[PDB]
């Protein structure tokens, strides 16, 4: 009565992350079918993340007042049905695809908010962590499976349409099994404190920078590689390679960071922000070489992106430790939620659209040729290393005030207790 619940919720989260990136792996086709440009090409992901951002806290609230199995089943059926129906739109409408992405966002946010509470409450203190970790290992695997599934099905059938109709039916299955196996189970005063905690603010802004980089690159890079292979007169394995890389890199970073922490925690007490800052600057150094390696040899570009992906995801498992190191316990429920909201408001909400806008504004004042389309996208994407470097300085800035923050925190907890 527990293992079945764990397995079914895990597969649910894998489907959740598999049905976000099926747009990207077929992006090149949509732009031609509907007669839109890049400025409209980024709007899909921008609207998706905006809907998710506005949705998640409301279902977080309602999850404590009505039953939760019902909400999970309703949400999974909702986004399955909407994503199945969206694939039948004709060539003269685009706002319908935009609205489709919004609704899929609502459903996905529902599931992602309410699953962890159940998978945590059905276990005790000592074993909660292992199954929570197994639950969270669904992120990179589904992320890669997105590109792989989209490219494989689109190539196999011969039309991009069925790229959005193979996934939902599998969801249609799960929507019933959760109704079979899993058993039923003053914030304002906090704000005036959290914005006076320097490490908290700087860590939040740094995570925002990381989110900007991740969203922009993850949406756009495959199209850039396609344009590169075209201009060099060498040319869709492109979407597959990338996927594979992700499915590995997310693990390595999450290991290496952790390891490098347990050493530096024994030589000083500023370990975590220093490790994160060093890794981030290294990531910037290697990322800024893709845009020069792609014009000579493609394998060099792939090696560069591999090292960048490894070093960029290192700080995934450290920011939580900082947050619980510098905040009193009875605020953590607040201090977490806010951060996630902010992490989306300055990050993936407006990144792909901004990249597309810059690219189109560059191209409108030059001749229309494959070469200049290449140069437009390549010059536009140069902002990612800039923001990575800025985030690195933000981690140094929090490494300065770390100790004083901890001292204040201990004084507060003892005074209250």
């Amino acid at each position, epitope marked *: 009565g527990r293992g079945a619940a764990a397995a079914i919720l895990s597969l649910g989260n894998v489907l959740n992350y598999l049905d976000r990136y099926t747009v990207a792996g077929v992006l090149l086709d949509i732009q031609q079918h509907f007669g839109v440009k890049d400025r409209g090409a980024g709007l899909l992901q921008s609207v998706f993340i905006c809907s998710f951002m506005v949705a998640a806290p409301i279902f977080g609230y309602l999850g404590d007042r009505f039953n939760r199995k019902v909400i999970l089943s309703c949400g999974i059926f909702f986004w399955s049905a909407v994503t199945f129906s969206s694939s039948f739109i004709p060539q003269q409408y685009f706002w319908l695809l935009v609205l489709s992405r919004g609704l899929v966002g609502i459903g996905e946010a529902s599931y992602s908010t309410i699953a962890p509470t159940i998978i945590g409450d059905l276990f005790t203190k000592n074993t909660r962590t292992l199954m929570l970790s197994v639950f969270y290992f669904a992120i990179p695997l589904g992320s890669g499976l997105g590109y792989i599934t989209g490219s494989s099905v689109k190539q196999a059938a011969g039309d991009w349409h069925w790229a959005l109709r193979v996934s939902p039916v599998l969801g249609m299955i799960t929507g019933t099994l959760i109704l079979i196996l899993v058993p039923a189970t003053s914030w304002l005063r906090d704000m005036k404190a959290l914005i006076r905690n320097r490490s908290y603010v700087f860590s939040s802004l740094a995570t925002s920078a990381v989110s900007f980089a991740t969203g922009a690159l993850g949406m756009w890079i495959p199209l850039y590689l396609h344009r590169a292979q075209v201009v060099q007169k060498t040319a869709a394995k492109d979407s597959l390679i990338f996927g594979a890389i992700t499915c590995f890199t997310g693990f390595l970073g999450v290991v290496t960071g952790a390891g490098a922490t347990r050493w530096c*925690r*024994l*030589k000083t007490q500023r370990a975590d922000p220093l490790v994160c800052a060093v890794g981030m600057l290294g990531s910037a150094i290697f990322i800024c070489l893709i845009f020069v390696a792609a014009k000579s040899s493609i394998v060099g570009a792939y090696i560069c992106i591999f090292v960048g992906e490894t070093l960029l995801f290192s700080n995934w498992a450290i920011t939580a430790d900082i947050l619980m190191y510098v905040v009193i316990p009875t605020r953590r429920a607040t201090a977490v939620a806010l951060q996630s909201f902010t992490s989306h408001l300055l990050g993936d909400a407006g990144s792909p659209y901004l990249i597309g806008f810059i690219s189109d504004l560059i191209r409108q004042s030059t001749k229309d040729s494959p070469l200049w389309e290449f140069l437009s996208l390549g010059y536009a994407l140069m902002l990612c290393p800039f923001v990575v470097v800025l985030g690195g300085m933000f981690f140094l800035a929090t490494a300065l005030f770390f*100790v004083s923050d901890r001292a204040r925190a*201990e004084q507060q*907890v*003892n005074q209250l*207790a």
Partner: nanobody
Amino acid sequence: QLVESGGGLVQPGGSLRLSCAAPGSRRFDYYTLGWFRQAPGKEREGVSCISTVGGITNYADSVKGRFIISRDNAKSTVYLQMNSLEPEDTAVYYCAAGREMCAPMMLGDYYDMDYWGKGTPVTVSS
């Protein structure tokens, strides 16, 4: 790991001092210090904990006014001093290291500590 030293047999009304040290060049100034005890027929209860920066200490209720815990990270040591022992204190003492904050009602959580020692015994005769 850590190394604990001291321990032995005392008469009622005496005093005894134990030490807990980090071998080698390791520092343990992040957060690493608390003392626990276990007896031959009861579960493991916490005795005391001391914090990182400000020298804030917290004790258990049955041992207030009799124990003192002190830290010294110039030589990488922590010390425990006991006065006015009774036949009830015969037990084995442990040194432990974790991340949570020194506060009341956090002594008894011995499932989140990162580093454990091996412990030394104290016996009180009559």
